Amino acid sequence: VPKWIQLNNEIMIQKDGKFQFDKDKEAVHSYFVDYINQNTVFFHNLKEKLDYLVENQYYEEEFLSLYSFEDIKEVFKTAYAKKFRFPSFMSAFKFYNDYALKTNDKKKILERYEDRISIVALFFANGDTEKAKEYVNLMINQEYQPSTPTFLNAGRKRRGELVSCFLLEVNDSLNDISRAIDISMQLSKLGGGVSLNLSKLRAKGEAIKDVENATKGVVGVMKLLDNAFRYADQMGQRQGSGAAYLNIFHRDINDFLDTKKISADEDVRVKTLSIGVVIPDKFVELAREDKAAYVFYPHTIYKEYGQHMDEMDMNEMYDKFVDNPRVKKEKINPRKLLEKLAMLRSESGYPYIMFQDNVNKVHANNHISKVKFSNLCSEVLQASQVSSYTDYDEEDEIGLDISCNLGSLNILNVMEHKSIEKTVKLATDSLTHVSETTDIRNAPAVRRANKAMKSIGLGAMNLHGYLAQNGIAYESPEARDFANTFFMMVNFYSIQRSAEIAKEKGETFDQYEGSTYATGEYFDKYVSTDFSPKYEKIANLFEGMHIPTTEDWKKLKAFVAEHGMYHSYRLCIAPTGSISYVQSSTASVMPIMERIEERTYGNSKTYYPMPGLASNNWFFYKEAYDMDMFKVVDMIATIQQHIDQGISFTLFLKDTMTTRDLNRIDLYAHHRGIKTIYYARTK
Amino acid sequence: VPKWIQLNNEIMIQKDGKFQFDKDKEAVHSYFVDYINQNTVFFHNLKEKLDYLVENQYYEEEFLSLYSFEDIKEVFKTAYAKKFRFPSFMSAFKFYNDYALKTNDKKKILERYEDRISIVALFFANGDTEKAKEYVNLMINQEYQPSTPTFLNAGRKRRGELVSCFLLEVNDSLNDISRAIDISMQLSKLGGGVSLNLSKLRAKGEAIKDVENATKGVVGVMKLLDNAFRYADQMGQRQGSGAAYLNIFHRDINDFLDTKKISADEDVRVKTLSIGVVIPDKFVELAREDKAAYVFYPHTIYKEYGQHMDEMDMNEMYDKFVDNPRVKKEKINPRKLLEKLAMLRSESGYPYIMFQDNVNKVHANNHISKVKFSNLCSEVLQASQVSSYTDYDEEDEIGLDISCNLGSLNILNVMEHKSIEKTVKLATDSLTHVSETTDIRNAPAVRRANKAMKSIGLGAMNLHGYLAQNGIAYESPEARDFANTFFMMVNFYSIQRSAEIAKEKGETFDQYEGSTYATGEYFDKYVSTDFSPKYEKIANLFEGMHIPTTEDWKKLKAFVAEHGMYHSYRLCIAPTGSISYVQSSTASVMPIMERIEERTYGNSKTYYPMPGLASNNWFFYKEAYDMDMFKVVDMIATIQQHIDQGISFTLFLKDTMTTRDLNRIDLYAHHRGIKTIYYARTK
Amino acid sequence: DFTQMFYNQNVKQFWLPEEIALNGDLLTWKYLGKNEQDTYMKVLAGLTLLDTEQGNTGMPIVAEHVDGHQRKAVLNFMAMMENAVHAKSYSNIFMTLAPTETINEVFEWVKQNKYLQKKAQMIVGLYKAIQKDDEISLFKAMVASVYLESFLFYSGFYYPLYFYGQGKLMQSGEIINLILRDEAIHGVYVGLLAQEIYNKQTEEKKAELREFAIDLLNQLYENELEYTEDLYDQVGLSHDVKKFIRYNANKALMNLGFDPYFEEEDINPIVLNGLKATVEPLKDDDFYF
Amino acid sequence: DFTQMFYNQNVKQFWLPEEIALNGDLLTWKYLGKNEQDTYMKVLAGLTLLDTEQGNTGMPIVAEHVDGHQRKAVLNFMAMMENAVHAKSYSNIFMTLAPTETINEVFEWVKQNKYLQKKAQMIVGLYKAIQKDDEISLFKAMVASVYLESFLFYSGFYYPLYFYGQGKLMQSGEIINLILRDEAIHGVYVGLLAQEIYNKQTEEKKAELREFAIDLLNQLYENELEYTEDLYDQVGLSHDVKKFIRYNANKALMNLGFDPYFEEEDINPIVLNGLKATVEPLKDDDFYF
């Protein structure tokens, strides 16, 4: 048993009726002094280390050649000038086991935390020494954390893509289905999660060019995609993860849901394919009034109207579809479908729930397209256009497939540094750089949408950690007040930075002129409502920091009208799974699942108290399962009103909660404006 | 019970100790006058019939527009002047259930046998009235039978392709694997059977861009292809049929064979994918000497030598691969592998066995490529060049993927009419037309190889029927003498027709000048050895029909050298499954399995005596299971020496014989020059 | 001279109640009077009790004391049939035809029925009195077992056979016929083992063993008469069943090598109508031709 | 919670020796060396001798002391498989491969063998020590039974599985695989019955029963190592057999609800080749807030 593992295990040994939280500092100190400093390759000078890394196929010479070695040395000086110390053993362990650069035999350590941060900053700045130093200060202060792909792979020769979330539209054709399988395998090969919209595919028992009842439906494509993701398993390193989305009004919705039942047949069940259900307001209205609903065969609708069923507004088109004799449908019970959804989420956590009209009532790019589905993590909500992949000899009609770049603000560190504006703008610049430097050669729609939309996702994390370390309960109205003010400021400065980038480059995103940013409809609630804190305690948290006012929002609206907006999408709150340990932060804006995290690595068990947990703030670190999910919905809806994309919203349920309770949580989330629901986690 | 199937069941009622074979004539007469003439749509004149069929999307207008209606009327008169009568109930039942045109609701019958034959003939002739009449005479006399795709779809609007056998080479890349899956689904959608070579794919545990043990092997691609063929099943009426081929020296050969074991897990076993094993003479030599053989990792060989393993000569490079330290190899026992092959064929009928050096020592187009795999029916043996499907933005290097049009001579009717030459030439013309009118716009390599190679497959059937109806035992030397003379004559006239077509069109097949036809080496055994029958009984069977001598073969060799050959491949003997009933013929050149064949169609049981079966030739219709497989191998090898492609050779095994007997049959087939072994059928 | 042929016969007779679909009896059951259904349930419950004890106790204990691995294998197989096949089949019948409350009630009824308790007490008492290496106590238990197999079951078997013979409850009846086919061979086999022990005795000892067998039979018989009247009076069949049990008592005696004890009588004719490829390694010479 | 499920799995696994033709094994048997033939014979006799104890004593004694009709039926079925199916199967394999005189000599040798006797008598000793109405002594015997079914057989099963995985002695290997599949379920079932007793005990009594189980495992394991070297050194396999013993010891412990004792090890690949929370409806007013 390692000495640091023993020291970390003494946290649970209760001395004087309290956990020994101070043992984790001893644990991390022992971990470093006994393992990391021993296994860290040291070089006489930074020049020798850099030469070894570039020449041994560890780094990329292209981005490092943009600086004189003096500038790189000063950047590394800035990283090491902070004397950053990991507060807990788990932070250092997670970094040096997941993100630190190791030798080709994975025996020694080439990169410390400072080296990784310096390389990421030098890649972000793209030749600017002052910008690189600013990125170094931002990341070594741990105010901004680039996503796991960006943080892990930036500046590495043998790297995967810096983007890991992709959203593909699948057209109703064998050519398009085969192309979707190919692109899914190519993107999973790069290490990215792939989400596929299956709503355009015609249902089971539909006609294929005069041969009726010949289509296997969305479940055959589901099996194809599941095997494609199983094959493209990231070189046998990490299991290939993909998601499939289907509209709740699709005829195959029940077959779509039956793929996740525990009793599912092996010719129906899918293993590596997550499922998400898209629910328009029409379905919730039908279930509310207990009227019997209809699911429609998409190809009949396409033949009758020339438009896909998911391309049309179900609120206005549902009655026309039902009254159309040439549109094929079967009766369903919407309440029974809702209960089936809740039962499936209780049993397996699936499907994801995307409230279509909650997303699109505040969507800023409805002119480009409505948001029809989400990503594998249920936070990316962007307009997509389906591609028409024709025969081999013909020319394909390339659409827009969603792929956004992820980054997370550390709410605790941004708040303690009083640097919401600077951190938000620098994170926007880094995400923009990642977007520009991303070129995917086997997903033409993804590449086209990356070049045109220039969409980024700037998330946040350590919300519960910041609140509990400041004596604020997560469910308290003061917590929602802080979230309101903080994310209003984040949105303000992200919009300002996007407009500044548009002014600097003289270009906006494609089809910006039709957006609500161009017409000013986006800024209505910001030029009409004041989002300053309503509590003196919360207003004191923002001391020394200018909270944007209504006049500031009017000035921003005028600036955006004059100069445009560079990013179609800017903010999305991803789960931030493994980077939260490195940042000593609670995951995303979700509340903590456990106060102290018990995990086993190898044959030794490890203990991870939540960051900042102590005796004084023990009960402010309320576990998510002990919380009222209605108040968590209230918090996420408070945040969601300032996030242009969605938020990964996990439901934390007790074992005593019934199907009716899960349905009530889902319906209250729909009522409160929640766009997506990620997971149903039961204790 | 239907009257016709009641009459057909009176065959088995033994009267005076004999089967009532004449009941089948009464059975078919009742079948017609009680079902067919009643359910047949009859028009006032042929003009109304043709207008009705063209207008209601049953026929194609383009091919019928090349003839004035007087010519079409003359063709239909020629078809009906024969007054063809089906000799058995099964012939008419199979035709009117599988190939006769029916109304859109599958209610009535639009085409008789004469109508279908006339339409196929007018399609073949392509505007020529006299040629259409010649084709009508050829098919109404049942001397030549177009394959099921051609006979079923010739001249129909809503039709599949006229070719159903496709062979695909898969390169060792994810782009090429995705393209292989796409092309397999596209061709299965067209109704064709697709065979894929998986030898170029690197084995399990190979590196994918310097990360080791990353490749899932050929079994992952096998699962992908199996699900692709399950998806593209054409309503499931005829589910997607695929074949995978692996060289026996591939490292994944044991896992490739384990996909067919009964005890295989659901994560390994493939169900819709047939498997074939390509065995070079090196493997048979290694097993014969009981030496230690080695299977190789294909990617190591490709990296070391720059060529794929299956693109190299194993009999000359096996020792170099073994001695090469940079080539990765695994030790196997070749005799244990042979025993495993025999056990797998006993328990499942798989794998197909291709003797690669038996194919390539007589292959005429080794300059283009060596034959590396066979088709799903294990009789197409043509040169293929792998394609290089690149990224979306890059141009693809299109290779040569095999596909040939099938057609069978009826040996009994051809020999009765003394029309080997005319039947062979007309069948060659029809197959050439089918090749020219085929355009696969989603399989680039299939299209390119169809345009370049112009390969056709002209098979034969009713060999056992003809021999049994002429008092010749299938195993007798006289039967092999007849097969030798008959198929030498067929080869002579097919080569003559190919040379005449090349002379008329002024073009040969691509890379003809490097072929053995151009060098004249192909004709060595024909200008040196006389193939006239050695028995007076057989010599009288060919009386009235000129048998080409050595002088005739020398003249043909000069003609080919001076004019070239239009088809790279001309003759392949396919199984000819369902068209054998319509033609009242035994299936292919293989011996019959049952003298009287009992089948259940729906809830009706009907019996099919072999064509011409009686008491005077009961024992000449010896079942395939009761005869020596060594003599059947001798017969197939006698036929194979005149066939440029392979012969679908089914092994008929008793329950008593062990795996050693199956291995002995396989080794004797390899010794006797058998190119492929199709099935190990056990009774 | 006989165990091997009994072994082969027993294993070739192997069956499970699930092989017989029972939903076909649903209508002929529905159509019976309440009296008929009551007697039928109770009859099968009495059979279930007998097989429960024959499987749990009787056959295993006799197996323990009989010498020879093959004899033990036959007796072990018979024991398995009693409780894993026969006793369970009755529950399959009950679960098809009757609601849970009626099933619960009939099992409560077996516990409190004095004739069924008396016959179980007597038979199981003799099983549990067997002493190791004491052939006389073993003989007495084997007589008890033959009387259970070949006599005591028959007051129960009568009624399913009576219906089967009229074309009623034929699926349940098929199960019962399979059970009866098994018990007939079980009674013969145990009878032969009992005769082995009897034949070792002096004439004086034999005379005492016959007294034991006849006294036991009469005691069981008198109890079975009361049981039969209790069950069958409500369906009008008691006298007919009594003739049947006397018939089968004679068969039990014969299985024990004794003369018939009751006079022959005409039995209801309805009830009579109720009755891989081998792997061979390749040789070197296989590669040359 | 489990007896009916195990009943189903047991009866659906029913098989008979006659189903596998054995004669084709002579085509690979003739090609084995003397040491291979010797080891195989000795292993086979070891399995035969241990399985006979389980059929004559182990299963019937547990069936006798366990309460519950359905459990007694399952246990009877398992005892039947030992005596009627497994024992005949082992005999059939022997009679096929060796002449009568060779069989008699191998059994004489294995009967005198120190390591086979040590384990056979240790197990039998615990079966003989069961006392009426004493669940502690029953538990100890169940532990012994699980150790036999799930652990002690496997030093023996190794060799037939090793041949079976190589394509040698396939007919007898198929038989052994069916036997092994029965012993696996026997071990799991008896394990659940032992856990039931264990869970009825105090914490101190539990700790005492754990110590008993581990101590017994240790004694048997140390003897298995000696048994293994004695049989397998002559064919060079002992190292790999030892890994297989430990892996199966861990399975036996898990059957008894205990933690694995030995570190995880990979097994010889040739031998490997041989081997709802609560639904509640939405009642309206849940759509309004």
Ligand SMILES: Cc1cn([C@H]2C[C@H](O)[C@@H](COP(=O)(O)OP(=O)(O)OP(=O)(O)O)O2)c(=O)[nH]c1=O
């Ligand atoms: C991407 C991928 C490839 N493979 C296998 C299948 C292909 O035959 C083989 C080649 O993959 P490639 O697509 O050629 O990968 P690569 O070009 O980046 O690697 P290399 O430089 O070695 O050519 O790898 C997998 O098994 N799983 C996978 O996820």
Ligand SMILES: Nc1nc2c(ncn2[C@H]2C[C@H](O)[C@@H](COP(=O)(O)OP(=O)(O)O)O2)c(=O)[nH]1
């Ligand atoms: N010497 C050295 N410095 C390293 C290494 N990895 C990162 N660094 C950082 C530490 C300093 O901030 C910076 C410059 O180190 P140096 O080259 O030793 O500089 P100097 O102090 O000699 O001027 O590089 C490393 O491996 N060696």
Ligand SMILES: Nc1nc2c(ncn2[C@H]2C[C@H](O)[C@@H](COP(=O)(O)OP(=O)(O)O)O2)c(=O)[nH]1
């Ligand atoms: N009348 C008619 N003829 C058919 C039909 N299908 C095929 N035929 C064939 C039969 C003859 O050989 C040929 C000409 O038939 P027709 O048009 O009736 O001509 P004719 O009998 O007046 O010369 O067409 C059909 O449906 N009707």
Ligand SMILES: [Mg+2]
């Ligand atoms: Mg289409």
Ligand SMILES: [Mg+2]
């Ligand atoms: Mg490649």
Ligand SMILES: [Mn+2]
């Ligand atoms: Mn019984």
Ligand SMILES: [Mn+2]
């Ligand atoms: Mn009995």
Ligand SMILES: [Mn+2]
């Ligand atoms: Mn056993």
Ligand SMILES: [Mn+2]
């Ligand atoms: Mn057992």
